[PDB]
Design an enzyme around this catalytic site. Structure first.
Site, PDB file in Angstrom:
ATOM      1  N   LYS A  23       0.870  -1.062   0.138  1.00 55.05           N
ATOM      2  CA  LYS A  23       0.036   0.122  -0.006  1.00 55.05           C
ATOM      3  C   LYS A  23       0.760   1.223  -0.058  1.00 55.05           C
ATOM      4  O   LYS A  23       1.922   1.478   0.572  1.00 55.05           O
ATOM      5  CB  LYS A  23      -0.782   0.124   1.254  1.00 55.05           C
ATOM      6  N   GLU A  24       0.449   2.276  -0.689  1.00 53.97           N
ATOM      7  CA  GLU A  24       1.299   3.414  -0.699  1.00 53.97           C
ATOM      8  C   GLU A  24       0.241   4.535  -0.697  1.00 53.97           C
ATOM      9  O   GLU A  24      -0.847   4.635  -1.009  1.00 53.97           O
ATOM     10  CB  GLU A  24       1.936   3.571  -2.198  1.00 53.97           C
ATOM     11  N   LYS A  75       5.575  15.388  -6.997  1.00 58.99           N
ATOM     12  CA  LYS A  75       4.990  14.540  -6.393  1.00 58.99           C
ATOM     13  C   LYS A  75       5.684  13.317  -5.545  1.00 58.99           C
ATOM     14  O   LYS A  75       6.704  12.789  -5.952  1.00 58.99           O
ATOM     15  CB  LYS A  75       4.047  13.805  -7.458  1.00 58.99           C
TER      16      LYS A  75
END
Lengths: 157, 156
Positions: free
Chosen positions: A71-72, A84
């Site tokens: 998960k990020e 970003k």
């Protein structure tokens, strides 16, 4: 601790704003799967609208070396500076001795009609697992720069 | 071209001067073979006294991935900034599409008694060989940082 970064830079013959528009776009999770099937098998949006705080679940293609899932979280989308930052928050390299694992995309103006895609992978790694630093290569994220620049260029054609 | 670099940083609890004294020392080619024979099989000094312009021939140990042999040159030994730049000039990654292949050691003073070893591998790579960027990993030169830091610490 092992503090480390890898960086690559791609020059692209379109304005920085045109590349940043896609790197910062909430549609990027779909484009990764659509444009890079040999890298990204499945990306689910778990929370958020695509702005800072958005959480994704990543599954890489079969046979890609571990880690293939994590998960990020989008922790920075700086429109001023076209930067970003995406941080892994569960699984992935965090299960392999890394205490922090960030990917940073910065789109640099070269001139009015060309730019540089700078892709940085930055990490902090437990020294007991220092050999895992060798999993992080200078080519990391180059394929994505290639896919996104190609998407922008050919759509202008 | 592929413009690229990998960097790692090691914190060391000795003064920057003591670490820079060894990284900048012309004896370093011998210490690499003496302390890391699992990596460096043979290093010959071809020309020079250890200052800028010195040329070395490197042969890596068997089983280390190609490229195992090259010549490199000391192109900068900046004592004020504690930065050493070593450039491959024949063979090595130049035979694999890299047009420039530099290693940069910078010793960063933190406070009077501690420093950081920053080891950078920086290159320019022909896009026909863009996949060869994956040969350059974030662990590059970390073993040398371990060997030199240990050499300095234990000898104090």
């Amino acid at each position: 601790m092992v503090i480390g970064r890898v960086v690559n830079e791609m020059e692209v013959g379109v304005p920085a704003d045109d590349i940043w528009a896609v790197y910062s776009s909430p549609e990027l999770p779909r484009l990764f799967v659509q444009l890079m099937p040999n890298v990204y098998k499945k990306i689910d949006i778990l929370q958020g609208d695509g702005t800072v705080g958005t959480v994704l679940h990543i599954e890489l293609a079969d046979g890609i070396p571990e880690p293939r899932t994590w998960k990020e979280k989008f922790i920075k989308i700086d429109h001023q500076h076209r930067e970003k930052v995406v941080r892994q928050i569960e699984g992935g390299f965090l299960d392999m001795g890394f205490r922090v694992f960030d990917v940073i995309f910065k789109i640099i103006e070269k001139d009015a009609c060309s730019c540089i895609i700078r892709s940085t992978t930055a990490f902090e790694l437990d020294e007991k697992f220092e050999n895992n630093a060798n999993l992080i290569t200078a080519g990391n994220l180059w394929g994505a720069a290639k896919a996104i620049s190609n998407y922008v260029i050919q759509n202008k054609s």
